Amino acid sequence: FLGLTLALSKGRILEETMPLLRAAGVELLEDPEASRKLIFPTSNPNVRVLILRASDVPTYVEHGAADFGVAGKDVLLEHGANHVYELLDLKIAQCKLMTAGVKDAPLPNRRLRIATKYVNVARAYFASQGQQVDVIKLYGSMELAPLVGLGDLIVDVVDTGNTLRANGLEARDHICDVSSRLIVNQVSYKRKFALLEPILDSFKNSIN
Amino acid sequence: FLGLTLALSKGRILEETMPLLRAAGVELLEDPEIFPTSNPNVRVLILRASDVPTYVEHGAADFGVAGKDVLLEHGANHVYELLDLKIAQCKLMTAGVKDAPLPNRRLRIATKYVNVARAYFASQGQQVDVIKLYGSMELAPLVGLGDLIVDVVDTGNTLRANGLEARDHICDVSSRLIVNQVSYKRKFALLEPILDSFKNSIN
Amino acid sequence: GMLPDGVADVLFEDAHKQEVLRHQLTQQLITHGYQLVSPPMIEFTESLLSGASEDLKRQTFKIIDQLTGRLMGIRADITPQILRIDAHHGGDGIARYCYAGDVIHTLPSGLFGSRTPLQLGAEIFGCESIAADIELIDVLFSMINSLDMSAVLHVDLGHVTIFKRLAELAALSASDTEQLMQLYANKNLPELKQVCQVLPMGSDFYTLARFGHDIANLLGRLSENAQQDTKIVTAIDELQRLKAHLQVQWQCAVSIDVTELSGYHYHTGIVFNGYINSETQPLVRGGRFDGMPRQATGFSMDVSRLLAHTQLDAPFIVLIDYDAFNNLDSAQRQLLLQQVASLRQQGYRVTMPLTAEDMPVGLTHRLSLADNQWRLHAV
Amino acid sequence: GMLPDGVADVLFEDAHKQEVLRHQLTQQLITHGYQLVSPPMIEFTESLLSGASEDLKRQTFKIIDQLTGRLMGIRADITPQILRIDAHHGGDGIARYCYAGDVIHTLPSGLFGSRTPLQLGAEIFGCESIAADIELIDVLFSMINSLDMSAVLHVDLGHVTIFKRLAELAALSASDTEQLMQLYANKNLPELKQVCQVLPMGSDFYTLARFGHDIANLLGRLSENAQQDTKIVTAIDELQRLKAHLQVQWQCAVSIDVTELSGYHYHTGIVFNGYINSETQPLVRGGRFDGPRQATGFSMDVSRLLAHTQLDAPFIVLIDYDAFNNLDSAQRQLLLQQVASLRQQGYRVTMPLTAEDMPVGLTHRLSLADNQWRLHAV
Amino acid sequence: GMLPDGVADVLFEDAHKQEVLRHQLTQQLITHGYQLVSPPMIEFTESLLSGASEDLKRQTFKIIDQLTGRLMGIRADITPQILRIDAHHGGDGIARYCYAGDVIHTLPSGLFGSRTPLQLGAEIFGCESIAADIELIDVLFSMINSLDMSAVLHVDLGHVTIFKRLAELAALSASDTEQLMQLYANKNLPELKQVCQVLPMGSDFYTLARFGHDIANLLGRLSENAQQDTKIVTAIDELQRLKAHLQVQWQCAVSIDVTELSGYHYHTGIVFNGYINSETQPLVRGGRFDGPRQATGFSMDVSRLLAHTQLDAPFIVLIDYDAFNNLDSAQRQLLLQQVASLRQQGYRVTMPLTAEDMPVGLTHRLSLADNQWRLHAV
Amino acid sequence: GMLPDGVADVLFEDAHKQEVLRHQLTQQLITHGYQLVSPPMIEFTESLLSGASEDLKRQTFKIIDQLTGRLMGIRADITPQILRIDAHHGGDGIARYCYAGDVIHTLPSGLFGSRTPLQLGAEIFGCESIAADIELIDVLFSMINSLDMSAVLHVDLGHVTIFKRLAELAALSASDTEQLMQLYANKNLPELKQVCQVLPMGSDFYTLARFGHDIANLLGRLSENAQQDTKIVTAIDELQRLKAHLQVQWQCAVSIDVTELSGYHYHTGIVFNGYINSETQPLVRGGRFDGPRQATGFSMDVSRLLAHTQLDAPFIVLIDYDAFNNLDSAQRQLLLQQVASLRQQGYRVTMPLTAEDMPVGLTHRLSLADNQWRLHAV
Numbered sequence A: 001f002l003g004l005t006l007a008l009s010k011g012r013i014l015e016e017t018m019p020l021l022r023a024a025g026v027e028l029l030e031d032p033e034a035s036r037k038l039i040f041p042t043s044n045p046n047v048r049v050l051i052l053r054a055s056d057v058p059t060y061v062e063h064g065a066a067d068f069g070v071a072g073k074d075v076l077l078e079h080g081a082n083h084v085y086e087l088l089d090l091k092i093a094q095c096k097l098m099t100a101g102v103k104d105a106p107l108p109n110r111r112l113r114i115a116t117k118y119v120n121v122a123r124a125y126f127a128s129q130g131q132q133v134d135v136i137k138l139y140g141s142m143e144l145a146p147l148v149g150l151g152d153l154i155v156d157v158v159d160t161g162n163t164l165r166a167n168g169l170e171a172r173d174h175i176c177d178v179s180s181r182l183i184v185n186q187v188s189y190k191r192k193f194a195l196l197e198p199i200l201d202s203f204k205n206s207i208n
Numbered sequence B: 001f002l003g004l005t006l007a008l009s010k011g012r013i014l015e016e017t018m019p020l021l022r023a024a025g026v027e028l029l030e031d032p033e034i035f036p037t038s039n040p041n042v043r044v045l046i047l048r049a050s051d052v053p054t055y056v057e058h059g060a061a062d063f064g065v066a067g068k069d070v071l072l073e074h075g076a077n078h079v080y081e082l083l084d085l086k087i088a089q090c091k092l093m094t095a096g097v098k099d100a101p102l103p104n105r106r107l108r109i110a111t112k113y114v115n116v117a118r119a120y121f122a123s124q125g126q127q128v129d130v131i132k133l134y135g136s137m138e139l140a141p142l143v144g145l146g147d148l149i150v151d152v153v154d155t156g157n158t159l160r161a162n163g164l165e166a167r168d169h170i171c172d173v174s175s176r177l178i179v180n181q182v183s184y185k186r187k188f189a190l191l192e193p194i195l196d197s198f199k200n201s202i203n
Numbered sequence C: 001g002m003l004p005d006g007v008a009d010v011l012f013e014d015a016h017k018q019e020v021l022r023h024q025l026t027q028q029l030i031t032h033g034y035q036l037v038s039p040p041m042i043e044f045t046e047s048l049l050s051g052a053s054e055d056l057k058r059q060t061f062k063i064i065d066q067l068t069g070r071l072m073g074i075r076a077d078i079t080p081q082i083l084r085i086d087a088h089h090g091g092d093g094i095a096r097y098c099y100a101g102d103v104i105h106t107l108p109s110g111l112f113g114s115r116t117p118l119q120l121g122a123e124i125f126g127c128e129s130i131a132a133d134i135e136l137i138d139v140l141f142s143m144i145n146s147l148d149m150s151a152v153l154h155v156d157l158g159h160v161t162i163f164k165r166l167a168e169l170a171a172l173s174a175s176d177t178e179q180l181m182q183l184y185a186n187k188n189l190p191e192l193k194q195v196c197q198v199l200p201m202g203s204d205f206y207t208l209a210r211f212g213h214d215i216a217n218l219l220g221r222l223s224e225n226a227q228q229d230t231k232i233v234t235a236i237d238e239l240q241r242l243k244a245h246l247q248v249q250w251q252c253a254v255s256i257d258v259t260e261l262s263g264y265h266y267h268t269g270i271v272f273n274g275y276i277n278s279e280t281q282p283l284v285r286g287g288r289f290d291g292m293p294r295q296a297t298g299f300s301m302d303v304s305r306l307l308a309h310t311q312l313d314a315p316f317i318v319l320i321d322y323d324a325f326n327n328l329d330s331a332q333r334q335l336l337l338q339q340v341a342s343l344r345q346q347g348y349r350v351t352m353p354l355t356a357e358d359m360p361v362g363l364t365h366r367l368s369l370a371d372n373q374w375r376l377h378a379v
Numbered sequence D, E, F: 001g002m003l004p005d006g007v008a009d010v011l012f013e014d015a016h017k018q019e020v021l022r023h024q025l026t027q028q029l030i031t032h033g034y035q036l037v038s039p040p041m042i043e044f045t046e047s048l049l050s051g052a053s054e055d056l057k058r059q060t061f062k063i064i065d066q067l068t069g070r071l072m073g074i075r076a077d078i079t080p081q082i083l084r085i086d087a088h089h090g091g092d093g094i095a096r097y098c099y100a101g102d103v104i105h106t107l108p109s110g111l112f113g114s115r116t117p118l119q120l121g122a123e124i125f126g127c128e129s130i131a132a133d134i135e136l137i138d139v140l141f142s143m144i145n146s147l148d149m150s151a152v153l154h155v156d157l158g159h160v161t162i163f164k165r166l167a168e169l170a171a172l173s174a175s176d177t178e179q180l181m182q183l184y185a186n187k188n189l190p191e192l193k194q195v196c197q198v199l200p201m202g203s204d205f206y207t208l209a210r211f212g213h214d215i216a217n218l219l220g221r222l223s224e225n226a227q228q229d230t231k232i233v234t235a236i237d238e239l240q241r242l243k244a245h246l247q248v249q250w251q252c253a254v255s256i257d258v259t260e261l262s263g264y265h266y267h268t269g270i271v272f273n274g275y276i277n278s279e280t281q282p283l284v285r286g287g288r289f290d291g292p293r294q295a296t297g298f299s300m301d302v303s304r305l306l307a308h309t310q311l312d313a314p315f316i317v318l319i320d321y322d323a324f325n326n327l328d329s330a331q332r333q334l335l336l337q338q339v340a341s342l343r344q345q346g347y348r349v350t351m352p353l354t355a356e357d358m359p360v361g362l363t364h365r366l367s368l369a370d371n372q373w374r375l376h377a378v
């Protein structure tokens, strides 16, 4: 295969990206949600799509298995985006990375225990606040961690704050703003710019 | 809360564990798809399988059920593996594209099971480059991210349906009962009745 | 900025406490006849790791001596340095040593464990008698008791000789030993009972795991081949002597675990592990290490682990009033400095201020001039 | 069991002495209002060497953190760690710190130097006044005097501000600075006179080396451009103030050298070097340094005091083996109480394991005569 | 017997291939008038790292010369050694050099990179003209084309002069430069747009990252202060000249990136990166350097060619054991002459020690039939 | 600047020569059925120094792998790497390996010796027969003869088995062995005769030193217990077979020394040392060792051949600058085809950048005379 491989996260990212793609001349030929397929052809026979877990998109793109992808700044910050180009803020799937603790419970006086997916983001943030923390890596749902005293706080993605409040947690500190970004393999940007430029302009046009 | 907190993985592990629990006097009071049980001493956490060792080793859970696959990958130094439950049986294997030949470079392995991968290829005297994947691995060989994958295999149907085939058998996988070191010393009186009912249920 | 995992500043009152503990405990050991030695942080690997387990070699950071090109290490353990020192200075008779020093580990031992413990310890060289093992317990408990801690030390007694004799007598393979040590370490009683039913003297290996704690009756539960072994009977007798001594002399709750093979693998007999409250990582590790032969037994503890369980009297932090002092004649100033010198000798922390705003941290008292007189005044 | 050059055991009575000195001196500093801090032996290089000279970077052993893959260092100097600590905890006001800890150097500093000094020191942060520099001298000499040493401390005063102002005003190149610092360090007056005849304000740079010692008249020997520089006039005035304070208050022989730039290059002003007797390596090194925060302090190798300090002979007691083993339980308990009393008084008492069990340097036996335990000189 | 990450044996046919490639390519460069030099693996750091960035210093393993006590390094790069050699032997005129040698890196450069590349390269010293940069491209593509590879080389052109002139004209701080070089290296366009709105000439620094690829129109997008700078206008003109030469002469797809500063920071002008297929780490790195002498050159890891080059299957011959041992002296001599003839023609002939002595990948037997020795495919 | 003692540039024609020698000799070994392997410069010490003498450990520079924190070494010898490779790939049958690579020594071996030899060698694994030792001599002398050297290789044969069997049979102490090896090494015949009169079978140890050279008669001079010992009779028979083979097949002057224990102490049987003219350090070192797996091989420093090998003077050609620039496109293409033809024939042709562009050691100009391009000696 000689054209562009686009890495997409399933769920929120996928649904909000289809309009940008359609405008760039790239329609998927069926609905992924009801398919046992992970490589999808499109109406542009140069472009094909991979449906991945959001955390694997930077991996596939940096190694060139995908030429470009859409992933949240949250996944990019955690993973480290040194080996890819973040060309475009797409301003889709907007949320924030925040610390969160039990509702009305105060910070204890001991060494803070943080439970999170976003281990590197956590270390970075608490470093910048001059705070030394013990970090516990969680792959799954983090809202449980403070309630059984695994961690004092969690670092997680927050939109309305409804998921926190419904589990007896509340947002404390704002770490940074999160939006899905267009990332490109460094080599793919140099070698396949002719194939990319039309789609990057159509994405640039769709946003502004 | 003064009693036992049981960490359970959702999916295959959960469905196969309910019978062992029922026999130990622990029924969940609703379908998960923090939970109280019919024994008011025991409560249950429904976690991602990979987080069970974490919750147990830190004492947020007193004991849990996780596959030998997750325990081998995580490292089970800080917990006690008390029981092979002989449920959710499968195997960790290497897998590649059907009939595709080994390249001449260092093999590139794409897998969740990064440490298991390094361990296995070490034991076969082979040096590998490993790429960490959190999601579905069957795609990795097909777009040439890795040469092989390390994944859990039951029938082998998921591999064959994606144009892959099992190569090497790494080890056998079964769900195990793990216990927090402190919980085993301090709450043995609450544990022993449930451990015996689990020991009894495997006959 | 941020520090590496398992590396922490000890600051302010914690630093003062650590300094007092290091000093009190070192002086105690010196008064019990232990010779203080202060070996360096770095040696050549030839001497530092001479007869070391792969675990001690892996815990030792390596560096290159730019004078010779040869490999050196940052010590992860002082005991091997005491061995080197004893070899040169100790002679053939009994010799006692104590030490306190920083050691560095490449990896932490426990969940969020320290990589920079302040290792403090004692070694007795040149005595075979269990009496030397009893003297060390006496010295250790003398030290623990002097700290007036709220927390209580649980002692776990083990003996590596017991399992090693059973392994030799039952002629276990290299791998069968590994499978039993793994099952012991995870207290897998069911899967052990299965493995043990097919092993020679297999019932003895199951007995260790099920009935090892009951040391009074352990001998009467072992096979005739095992019961006849002098090294096993000695081992079980040493545990009973120490267990008794610890309960009678020191009112210590002792638990026996003859499946404990977890310390530094240079251990050759009796092993002791002191746990503080319900903490997973032991405060104190000790046991026999006859093997450079020279007889040797000792213990080490991380002084830093005592911090959370020891208290000092709140300190007196005194600030001399700036304005009042500068209003004094020369003779009046000299008179104050004599009074300040008296306070410092008594352990008062007195700041002679540089400015009106010069404020010591956690101020308790002001030294103030009221009716031509200098007195302490709580704030 | 050979050791690396510049690495030595401190053994037995020397180890006891070192432990007493470390503790006496730490307690003195604490009672003078200095906060004891004990920072770790290892940090990431990012924090440990943050704004460090090539000399400090070269003296720091590097090691690999296997958790992150990042570089760490074994500290060669604690002062940078006090700076990090002060930055977080110190605030904007005055803050005092003291420390005692092992540091490791890759290379020895001078002729047969240690690579493992026990660095003990004090820092004052947040005061511009020469008063802070005067307090530290007073604290240091308070400490030196408490040791009741026979040996005497010669103090060498320098000031890096003087050369640094001349370097800025004469607009020196990177390499010309290096050639002058090399020549200054061996006080090569002939080869300096040659180099200085071609340099701008070159006569001023030669004046530093030839007439730096005579601080009373140094200003009147400098070029008009130099003499009008406020930072140079302040610098030379600070040396005169400290020289006077040291002679008047402390009866200390002071020598000036305004070309001493051999200390750690984080120094930004006054520098102090304390030499014990005629020893090549200074015992004490101190000076001004900077974060936008004022800082001054000193450090000393406690190990260098050992050969010049003495303690009271220790009392080393051996309980008679045969007599003790002849005792009933109640009689044994009675002895242990008496032995506990002796240890509390600082007696070194060995409860023997065998008849041959002999403590090193035995002074006294605790012996049983007529149902009574008494000390007996051997 | 596991090896360190980024260290691999090159074995058997791969080793033969590597040896052929090393030799073919070295002879090509020699016939193009490049002088072969073979400098040592180790020098003193004074010479090996003379005017080196932190990146080159960090990639160089350090070792101790036990004769002098001085620091040496295992070379991570040969180019600085060519510079030393040229300084002594080269004179003021034009000089050409080629080299092939092992170099060692402390860390791998990219995802699963080698730490032991076989570095092969050419340098032209003493010519300012872009003509020297064009000769090297011609020599390199002459070499690449001779390999008859299926894989294709994508060339990336950069120019460090452009950013360095903008840094000087905008009078950027030491730290601001670092933050821009970090952002450029991940082409973080959003976070760069934010940083650039507060920097002097900030729009020019954003223009480099967003519109650097479009070199035809880049000049017309820069600030008037920037557009007036001769060194920037020359730089952008040099890129256009090379881009044109590569497309016209060589039918080469060129991409421009004027923010490429990831090569060794001794580069002073034009930079070239050759990528093979879609591989992350470039095969070829080249550019201008000046450590008062003009210099330009390139280097490549010969080992990276292995997976993309093929040799004719080799002829591996085994002499029949039993037949040979049945021969008289004169008959044996006659065979050895025939075997010598086969080896001269490049046949791999094994004279067997036993009946079981079997060469790996046997293709032919040399067998005796009717008093005659002939080859027989197995 | 200056280079470390025992470290030298190989420049220009010496570099060309070294490159040709490395390649010719590697191809020869490959055609004799030896598998080329190219193992890395650095491994973990665990594998690199696995079963090594203290001499090989001390010749190996140590470095820290920053990925793992573990110790690595720059190889001082490739043979141990062939052993590792053979262990994995070789199997139980016979296996042949050849190699050429740089190795680094911490100290020079002889007065002003190299610390950076280009080690080239062959190993046979899995054959007990002296036949394998004879094949290696055949391969070596095939290589030496192909070099057309003026200098002559003197071969010294030893056999460590002989002395080791005498040491075992005479039941010598640890220290008595040391005193005999010291006396042998300094050919102290008088002080040996004294020591030997008190040792059991002492006359046999004296016989080795006095009559070891005369291998034809050595067996008939030894004690009855020695003369019957199978391992001694085999050893002396192996020396006679090799001595004969070297003189008859290869016209090589052989000297025997059964008291030679010089070379890497991993040697376990026959040993060969090739000396070039009257040079103190041997060019070639070889003999038996153990992978249990049988092993024999040799190594040589290719760089030691340079001073004794000559190549045909090279043709260094400069195309006339002015004439070339006067050509149309079709005329330029026509020249480049002619230039390509010359380079294929090994001519060194420089396409000039300027009128002054002069290749080093110019022999010929390619000049245009009467619409034709011809070579012209200068």
Ligand SMILES: O=P(O)(O)OC[C@H]1O[C@H](OP(=O)(O)OP(=O)(O)O)[C@H](O)[C@@H]1O
Pocket (backbone or CB within 6 Å): A011, A012, A156, A157, A158, A159, A160, A161, A162, A163, A164
């Ligand atoms: O702030 P709120 O409005 O409550 O929503 C934020 C939540 O939305 C996501 O859930 P989801 O499980 O849908 O994300 P994922 O499945 O894509 O990981 C994410 O995990 C947040 O917890």
Ligand SMILES: O=P(O)(O)OC[C@H]1O[C@H](OP(=O)(O)OP(=O)(O)O)[C@H](O)[C@@H]1O
Pocket (backbone or CB within 6 Å): B010, B011, B012, B049, B152, B153, B154, B155, B156, B157, B158, B159
């Ligand atoms: O029957 P097979 O074709 O051999 O496949 C069995 C599957 O079971 C595992 O995932 P599962 O969906 O059971 O659990 P998970 O979703 O929690 O990983 C695993 O990923 C296999 O693909």
Ligand SMILES: N[C@@H](Cc1c[nH]c[nH+]1)C(=O)O
Pocket (backbone or CB within 6 Å): C077, C078, C079, C121, C122, C123, C263, C264, C285, C286, C287, C288, C289, C297, C298, C299, C300
């Ligand atoms: N040094 C050992 C304890 C010990 C001292 N002597 C014998 N054992 C440890 O750190 O665990």
Ligand SMILES: N[C@@H](Cc1c[nH]c[nH+]1)C(=O)O
Pocket (backbone or CB within 6 Å): D077, D078, D079, D121, D122, D123, D263, D264, D285, D286, D287, D288, D289, D296, D297, D298, D299, D300
């Ligand atoms: N740390 C310095 C002395 C010092 C402390 N503060 C200022 N100077 C040294 O050892 O050389």
Ligand SMILES: N[C@@H](Cc1c[nH]c[nH+]1)C(=O)O
Pocket (backbone or CB within 6 Å): E077, E078, E079, E121, E122, E123, E263, E264, E285, E286, E287, E288, E289, E296, E297, E298, E299, E300
């Ligand atoms: N030696 C450089 C390439 C180069 C040669 N000359 C100039 N640049 C490298 O390997 O990256």
Ligand SMILES: N[C@@H](Cc1c[nH]c[nH+]1)C(=O)O
Pocket (backbone or CB within 6 Å): F077, F078, F079, F121, F122, F123, F263, F264, F285, F286, F287, F288, F289, F296, F297, F298, F299
């Ligand atoms: N490697 C040895 C020679 C040898 C190879 N095989 C056996 N001996 C040397 O350099 O001296």
